[PDB]
Amino acid sequence: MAWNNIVFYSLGDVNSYQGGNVVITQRPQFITSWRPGIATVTWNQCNGPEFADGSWAYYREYIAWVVFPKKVMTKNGYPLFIEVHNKGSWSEENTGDNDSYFFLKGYKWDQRAFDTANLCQKPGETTRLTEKFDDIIFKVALPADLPLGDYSVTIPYTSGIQRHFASYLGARFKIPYNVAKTLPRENEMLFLFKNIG
Ligand SMILES: CC(=O)N[C@H]1[C@H](O[C@H]2[C@@H](O)[C@@H](CO)O[C@H](O[C@@H]3[C@H](O)[C@@H](O)[C@H](O[C@H]4[C@H](O)[C@@H](O)[C@H](O)O[C@@H]4CO)O[C@@H]3CO)[C@@H]2O)O[C@H](CO)[C@H](O)[C@@H]1O[C@@H]1O[C@H](CO)[C@H](O)[C@H](O[C@]2(C(=O)O)C[C@H](O)[C@@H](NC(C)=O)[C@H]([C@H](O)[C@H](O)CO)O2)[C@H]1O
Ligand SMILES: [Zn+2]
Ligand SMILES: [Zn+2]
What's the Rg (C-alpha) of the chain?
A: 19
What ligand is nearest to the CA atom of residue 27?
2
Q: Backbone dihedral region of 88: left (phi > 0), alpha (psi from -120 to 50 degrees) or beta?
A: left
Identify which of 189, 177, 168 has the alpha carbon closest to the alpha carbon of residue 80: 189
Measured in Å, residue 67 CA sits from the centre of ligand 1 at: 20
For domain 1-197, the question of CATH label 3.20.20.70 is answered with no
Identify residues whose C-beta is under 5 A from ligand 3, the ion. 143, 145
State in Å: Cα 46 to ligand 2 middle.
41
Number of CB atoms found within 10 A of residue 100's CB: 19
Q: Is 177 in the pocket of ligand 1 (CB under 6 A)?
A: no
The ligand that comes nearest to the alpha carbon of residue 102 is 1
63 lines ligand 1 (CB under 6 A): yes
Q: Domain extents for the chain?
A: 1-197
Could you tell me if the CB of 104 is within 6 A of ligand 1? yes
Neighbour-count burial of 148, counting CB atoms closer than 10 A to its CB (0-12 exposed, 13-18 middle, 19+ buried) = exposed
Q: Which of 6, 63, 65, 168 to mutate to test the pocket of ligand 1 (most atoms within 8 A of CB)?
A: 63
Ligand having the closest approach to the CA of 146: 3
Give which of 174, 165, 196 is closest to 4, Cα–Cα: 165
Distance CA 193, CA 142 (A): 11
* 85 CB near ligand 1 (under 6 Å): no
One-letter-per-residue 3-state SS of the chain: CCCEEEEEEEECCEEEEEEEEECCCCCCEEEECCCCEEEEEEEEEECCCCEECCCCCEEEEEEEEEEEECEEECCCCCEEEEEEEECCCCEEECCCCCCEEEEEEEEEEEEEECCCEECCCCCCCEEEECCCCCCEEEEEECCCCCCCEEEEEEEEEEEEEEEEEECCCCCCCCCCHHHHCCCCCCEEEEEEEEECC
Give the span between the Cα atoms of 148 and 31, in whole angstroms: 24
> In Å, what is the CA distance from 91 to each residue of 29, 50, 98, 171?
20, 30, 18, 20
**DSSP bridge pairs for 155:** 189
Distances (CA, A) of 52 to 58, 63, 107, 167: 8, 20, 22, 11
What whole-number distance in Å separates Cα of residue 78 and Cα of residue 164? 40
For the Cβ of 125 lying below 6 angstroms from any atom of ligand 1, the answer is no
Q: Is 116 exposed, middle or buried (0-12, 13-18, 19+ CB in 10 A)?
A: exposed
